[PDB]
C-alpha cells in the first residue's frame, strides 16, 4: 500500500482558499504568555521609585528621603500620576529632554560643590515652607538652598566653580516669582532683581513676574528650575541680585546611551531577559506578540491577532 496516515491530536487551521482543516501537531509563533513580574535586564538592574517623580527625586523631596543614592541602572519605573511630585507649585524647564537623557546613565554620584559655610553674608537657615512638611514641622528641599536677607540687605553674588574632575556634572538652580510688591521687601529688599548665568556655550538672563494667581497647595507663588552640563575644563559663573535658589549638590555622569521611562505598578522579581513590557517580562523566541506595544529593548513585532499557527502536518 501507499499513503501516510495519522489519527491523533486536533488543531484546525485556515488558509487562503480553505478555512478549516485539521492539522496534526501544529505550532505557534505568537507570544501571548508572560510572567506578571518586573525583573532585571542584562546585568544592570532597573531603578525603582515608589511614590515619587523624577523631579522630586533629583531635587530632594522630603517625603522621598529613602533614595539617597544608586550606583547605576538601565531604565526607570514610575507610577502613573505619582502623589508627591513637586510640593511647591511651579515647573521644570525642558523636563522631557532631561527625562530622555537621564535614562541609561552608567555612573551616578553626589558631591558637595558649594559648601553651606561659603555664604558668610547671607542667611541659609530660615528658608522653610509649609507646603513641604516633614514630621509635622515645615521644611524644604535638600539639594538646593533658598537664600534671603541676612541683616537687612542682599549683596550681589559673584561665585564661580571650576570643574577639576575628569567627568561631566549636572547642575540645577532656580528662580522665585512673588505675589505682590509688599512680599518682596520681607525677603529681598531690592525691588527690581535679575539673575545671570554664563558658561562657554551658555548665556542667559532672567527677571521675576509679579501678579495675582489662584491657590494651589495653599500658595499663590511659583518656582522655576533649570539645568546644564559642563565639561572637564569649563567653568560656570553665577551673578544674582535676588530671587535666587542656589545649588548645593551636583551629580557626576558618564552618559553612554539612551532609553525611556516605564509607567506601571507591577511587583519586583529576579529574572534575566532582553525586553520588558509594562505588564510583565517575556523571554521571547517567536517573532510576533500581542501583549503591549510599548517596550524597552529588543522585542518581537506587534500584530494585533490571536491565531498565528502554521507549523506542519499531514491531512
Amino acid at each position: 500500500c501507499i499513503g501516510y496516515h495519522a489519527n491523533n491530536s486536533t488543531e484546525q487551521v485556515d488558509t487562503i482558499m480553505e478555512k478549516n482543516v485539521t492539522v496534526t501537531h501544529a505550532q505557534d509563533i505568537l507570544e501571548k504568555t508572560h510572567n506578571g513580574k518586573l525583573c532585571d535586564l542584562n546585568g544592570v538592574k532597573p531603578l525603582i521609585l515608589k511614590d515619587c517623580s523624577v523631579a522630586g527625586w533629583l531635587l530632594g523631596n522630603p517625603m522621598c528621603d529613602e533614595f539617597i543614592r544608586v550606583p547605576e541602572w538601565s531604565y526607570i519605573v514610575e507610577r502613573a500620576n505619582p502623589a508627591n511630585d513637586l510640593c511647591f507649585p511651579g515647573s521644570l524647564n525642558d523636563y522631557e529632554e532631561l527625562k530622555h537623557m537621564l535614562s541609561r546613565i552608567n555612573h551616578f554620584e553626589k558631591i558637595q560643590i558649594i559648601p553651606k559655610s561659603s555664604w558668610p553674608n547671607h542667611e541659609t537657615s530660615l528658608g522653610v515652607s509649609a507646603a513641604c512638611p516633614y514630621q509635622g514641622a515645615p521644611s524644604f528641599f535638600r539639594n538646593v538652598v533658598w537664600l534671603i536677607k541676612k541683616n537687612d540687605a542682599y549683596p550681589t553674588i559673584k561665585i564661580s566653580y571650576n570643574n577639576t574632575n575628569r567627568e561631566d556634572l549636572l547642575i540645577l538652580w532656580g528662580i522665585h516669582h512673588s505675589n505682590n510688591a509688599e512680599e518682596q521687601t520681607n525677603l529681598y529688599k531690592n525691588p527690581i532683581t535679575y539673575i545671570s548665568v554664563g558658561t562657554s556655550t551658555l548665556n542667559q538672563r532672567l527677571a521675576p513676574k509679579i501678579a495675582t494667581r489662584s491657590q494651589v497647595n495653599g500658595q499663590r507663588g511659583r518656582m522655576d528650575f533649570f539645568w546644564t552640563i559642563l565639561k572637564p575644563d569649563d567653568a560656570i559663573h553665577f551673578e544674582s541680585n535676588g530671587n535666587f535658589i542656589a545649588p548645593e549638590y551636583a551629580y557626576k555622569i558618564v552618559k553612554k546611551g539612551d532609553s525611556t521611562i516605564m509607567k506601571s505598578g507591577v511587583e519586583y522579581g529576579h529574572c534575566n531577559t532582553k525586553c520588558q513590557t509594562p505588564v510583565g517580562a517575556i523571554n521571547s523566541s517567536m517573532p510576533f506578540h500581542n501583549i503591549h506595544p510599548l517596550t524597552i529593548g529588543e522585542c518581537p513585532k506587534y500584530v494585533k491577532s490571536n491565531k498565528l499557527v502554521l507549523a506542519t502536518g499531514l491531512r
Partner: antibody
Amino acid sequence: QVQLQESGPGLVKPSETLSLTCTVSGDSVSSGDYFWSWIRQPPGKGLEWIGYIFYGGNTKYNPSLKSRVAISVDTSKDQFSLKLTSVTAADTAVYYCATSYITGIQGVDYWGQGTLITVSS
Amino acid sequence: EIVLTQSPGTLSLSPGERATLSCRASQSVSSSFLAWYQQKPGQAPKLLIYGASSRATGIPDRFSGSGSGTDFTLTISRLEPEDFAVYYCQQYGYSLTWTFGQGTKVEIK
C-alpha cells in the same frame, strides 16, 4: 494684611469646659502661609504658649497644658476656636489671637485685642 | 525648656541717657531665632527687633541692639518722653519651646 476679633463668654463654672472664637477678616483662613496660634497671660504674671495650627491638620502643643487642649479650624465662617477642658482655679487667661509668617519667620506682628475670662462657682 | 532671665529688675533714668537691658539664657541659642518686644498697658506687645539686631518697619532710629551666643543686650540710645513700658524676650524657632521671659520695666527717675 489681617485683622482679628475674638469676643467670647466671660464666666464659666468649674469642672466644665471653655470655648472662644476668633474671626479673620481680609486674607482667608485657608491661606497656607500663617501660624494661627493661641497665647495666654495670667494676670500679674508673664506670657506663655499653648499651641498653633497651620495649613493641613498639623498642630503642636506646650508640654504644660497638653491633655486638656484642642485647637480646631473651619473654612465656612473663617474661624478657629479653642476648647480648654478640665478647668481649674489656675486657668484664668486673657486668650490672644496671634499670627506669624512661616517662610522667613520674623517676630509675631499681628495680634488681637484681648478678652478676660474668670472661673469660679 | 529654655529659660530666659532678664538681668535688670527695674531701671529709673532721667531723659537723655541709654538703657543696658540684657537677656541671659540657659542653653546657647542661635542669633537668627530671637526677637524683642514692647508692651504698653492694655492692647498688646508689638515687635521691636527681629533677628540678632535688625529694626522693624516703622521703628525709629533710636532703638538698637547687640549680642550673640548666650549674652544679648539692648539700648534705647536717647530717652524721650514717650518711652516707658515693659519688654519681653522670645525664643521663636522650630525647637517647640517657645518660652518668653519674666519681663523688665523702666519708669521715671
